[PDB]
Write a protein that binds this ligand. Sequence first.
Ligand SMILES: *[C@@H]1O[C@H](CO)[C@@H](O)[C@H](O)[C@H]1NC(C)=O
Length: 246
Amino acid sequence: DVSFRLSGADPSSYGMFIKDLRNALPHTEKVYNIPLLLPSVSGAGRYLLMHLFNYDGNTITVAVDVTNVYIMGYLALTTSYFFNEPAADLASQYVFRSARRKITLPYSGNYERLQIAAGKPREKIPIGLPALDTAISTLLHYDSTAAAGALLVLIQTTAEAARFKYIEQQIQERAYRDEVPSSATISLENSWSGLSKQIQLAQGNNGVFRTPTVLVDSKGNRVQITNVTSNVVTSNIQLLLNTKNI
Ligand SMILES: *[C@@H]1O[C@H](CO)[C@@H](O)[C@H](O)[C@H]1NC(C)=O
């Protein structure tokens, strides 16, 4: 398992937690020095448990599929919660079985359905360590509308930070003050699978992308990524979605 405590949290302890999260995901190869996530994992070992503690020490346990870093559901006291999708239904077979009751959230775990549920797009939800402390607190007591926004914060400050150093850094900058994510952060989030694909494809194509990826840069400019010499590949993405899951 991995764990993170908001009480006494700082940019360094967050960085350490995000490093553990990445290191709990299994892989058998690197592609251009980037861990390549497995095509699949059988049984319960498919699911990493992340124990998060809010500032008062209250906890939820979040279940993550180690193949794609998708959050499946979480446990809050004796109640489990899962997204309304087949993958999460599958996960509920394996984790949080000892929960007294299971609630299925009235949405699937993707950004489009979560933004609908929450009534706002990601671009307008500030994120950061304080927003994470709030999200953990909210998820402690069921409220489906509030939970959608909480889950958008949670996904971004855990899974999206593990995938990209740039997002991990953005969260670090927001250790003590939340702020909406930069368009770059949104761009990376949206492009993870495509980048993961083009990096794998580059092996066999001399480090060149079969199709270039358009991102937005740190300065708000459109940039086009064409090959594995880009900083995005050398010094940003930390985990690749296996092309068998694309
Ligand atoms: C690849 O990426 C670099 C950095 O983005 C770019 O300037 C360069 O011209 C590209 N090279 C090729 C061979 O496509």
